[PDB]
């Protein structure tokens, strides 16, 4: 759904690195370079951002139950 | 030939008896003819059992299922009582029979 903070394997904070990763992907960098620029050296951390899918955007399309 | 060599207990050798049996029992085995008669009767009964087995088991299948493992407890008796095969035994064959 949403980017999970605290990478499961080790515990490094990755909940704040999703928007920056998206920006780096959108502008110049490939996924490997974007992850390297974010300081994710252990592949357990890189799998969190790389394999993440963000359904939170899809869930926001629907109108809220209360306006 | 092998059956006779393995199960007869040839007492005539007077050297194998000294090697395997105690010195005291060798004279008892040789002197008394009743010992030899009982031993020959045992061998005759064993030969009859051999014939019965060959009637019962064609094709020579020697693997059979039986209640207690004779060889295993013979080995257990050897180890429990610290039996030394290098030395002559003190067991009288008539006592075995």
């Amino acid at each position: 759904m949403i980017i999970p903070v605290r990478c499961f394997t080790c515990g490094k904070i990755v909940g704040n690195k999703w928007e920056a990763y998206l920006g780096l992907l959108q502008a110049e960098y490939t996924e490997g370079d974007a992850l390297d620029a974010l300081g994710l050296k252990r592949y357990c951390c890189r799998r969190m951002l790389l394999a993440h899918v963000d359904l939170i955007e899809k869930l926001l399309n629907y109108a809220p139950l209360e306006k | 030939k092998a059956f006779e060599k393995k199960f007869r207990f040839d007492y005539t050798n007077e050297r194998a008896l000294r090697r395997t049996l105690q010195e005291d029992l060798v004279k008892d085995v040789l002197s008394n003819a009743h010992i030899q008669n009982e031993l020959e009767r045992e061998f005759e009964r064993m030969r009859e059992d051999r014939e019965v087995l060959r009637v019962i088991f064609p094709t020579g299948d020697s693997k059979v299922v039986l209640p207690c493992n004779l060889l295993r407890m013979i080995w257990n008796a050897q180890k429990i009582f610290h039996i030394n095969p290098r030395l002559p035994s003190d067991l009288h064959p008539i006592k075995v029979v």
Binding site: - | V65, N69, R72, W75, N76, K79, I80
Partner: protein, 144 residues
Amino acid sequence: SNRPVMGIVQDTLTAVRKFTKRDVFLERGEVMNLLMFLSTWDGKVPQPAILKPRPLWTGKQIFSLIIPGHINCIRTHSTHPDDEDSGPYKHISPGDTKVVVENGELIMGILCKKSLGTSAGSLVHISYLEMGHDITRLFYSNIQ
């Protein structure tokens, strides 16, 4: 089928095979750690197979403590070639195959499904028949 149905299976069996070889040698602390998981252990640490320069036990030496009472059994490892029984090294086993357990002590050999597994004449079968169900239960648990 007059065989044991339970047997040392899967992970414990593979580790038994890797632990029963001549190659394994255990230091002092590892020996202590292994010994405390033996429920029927009498509390006497066996003298290591190697004493000098440093005391090293062997996998067979420690496993012999697990074997209950005085169990006598002869098996063959799965690797056992048929040439060994004919020629020399019949009782020396250069590949350390075959199994000889004498007076309840693992003297030589590699244990596998042919020894601790569910088969007729297996080491566990001999343990059940000679000793009894209660002690064989502890034998199973201690091995595991």
